[PDB]
Design a protein around this ligand. Structure first.
Ligand SMILES: C[C@@H](c1ccccc1)n1cc(-c2cc(F)cc(F)c2)c(=O)[nH]c1=O
Length: 244
């Protein structure tokens, strides 16, 4: 009804999209795009469109538009996801370049948080890279419609907030400083809640600066309230990057 009218500015007409679930290459008119096919719930998908169409930040993947299986049209990202990029042979980003990637994630997340957007699945596998190696926060498989990245309160209560996203970002920083290493590889899926309650945490990566590892430890506080906001994380990571 009114949702139907509110999504008109995000709806793309079939005479403007050429598709060539999963992601397929496609062309858009208003240009090269990525089109994900989505194999009650349609109502929640439409409100997401209204929200994500408002997005305009250099570190956030933009939503070009939506199709009526429903399709999602996103800008094409040449170097794919961040996690696979830091594990690829052809790319050798320095430790300063990895810190820089993390800062771009923090600024895009600062933007998402300024707009009251709780990501729910922040991980390096969900951040894309474009042709200029700009890191763009994205979701490659529905989250608002991954236990080794979830906050303690999310594991126990199933509640997701911006402070629980800060916890996921701490794990994302670890992934970057380890170059795509699986967090908690010897901790069962069914054992992390007790492991985290007992105080235990991920250890300092070999090539991680001491102030940057303190930042990861701040994101992993048992109290969500005691965790640094995204604005604070941008401030602290910019400070580290400038003096590294
Ligand atoms: C815009 C981008 C994103 C996601 C999170 C944070 C920032 C940016 N994005 C949006 C959707 C999406 C779009 C919709 F219109 C409805 C929906 F259900 C999902 C998606 O599947 N993947 C993805 O990367």
């Amino acid at each position: 009804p009114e949702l139907v009218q509110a999504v008109q500015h995000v709806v793309i007409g079939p005479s403007s999209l050429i598709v060539h679930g999963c992601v397929y290459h496609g062309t858009l008119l208003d240009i090269h795009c990525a089109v994900k096919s989505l194999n009650g719930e349609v109502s929640q998908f439409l409100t997401e469109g209204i929200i994500m169409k408002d997005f305009s930040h250099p570190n956030v993947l933009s939503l070009l538009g939506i199709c009526l299986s429903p399709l999602v049209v996103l800008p094409y990202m040449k170097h794919g996801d961040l996690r696979n990029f830091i594990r690829n042979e052809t790319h050798n980003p320095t430790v300063k370049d990895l810190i820089g990637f993390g800062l771009q994630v923090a600024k895009g997340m600062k933007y998402l948080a300024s707009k009251k957007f709780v990501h729910r699945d922040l991980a390096a596998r969900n951040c894309m890279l474009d042709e200029k190696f700009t890191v763009k926060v994205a979701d490659f498989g529905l989250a608002r419609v991954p236990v080794k990245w979830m906050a303690l309160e999310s594991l126990q209560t199933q509640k997701f907030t911006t402070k629980s996203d800060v916890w996921s970002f701490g794990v994302l920083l670890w992934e970057l400083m380890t170059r795509g290493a699986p967090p908690y590889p010897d901790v069962n899926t069914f054992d992390i809640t007790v492991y985290l309650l007992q105080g235990r945490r991920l250890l300092q990566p070999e090539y991680c600066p001491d102030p940057l590892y303190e930042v990861m430890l701040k994101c992993w506080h048992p109290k969500a309230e005691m965790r640094p906001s995204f604005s604070e994380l941008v401030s602290r990571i910019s400070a580290i990057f400038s003096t590294f």
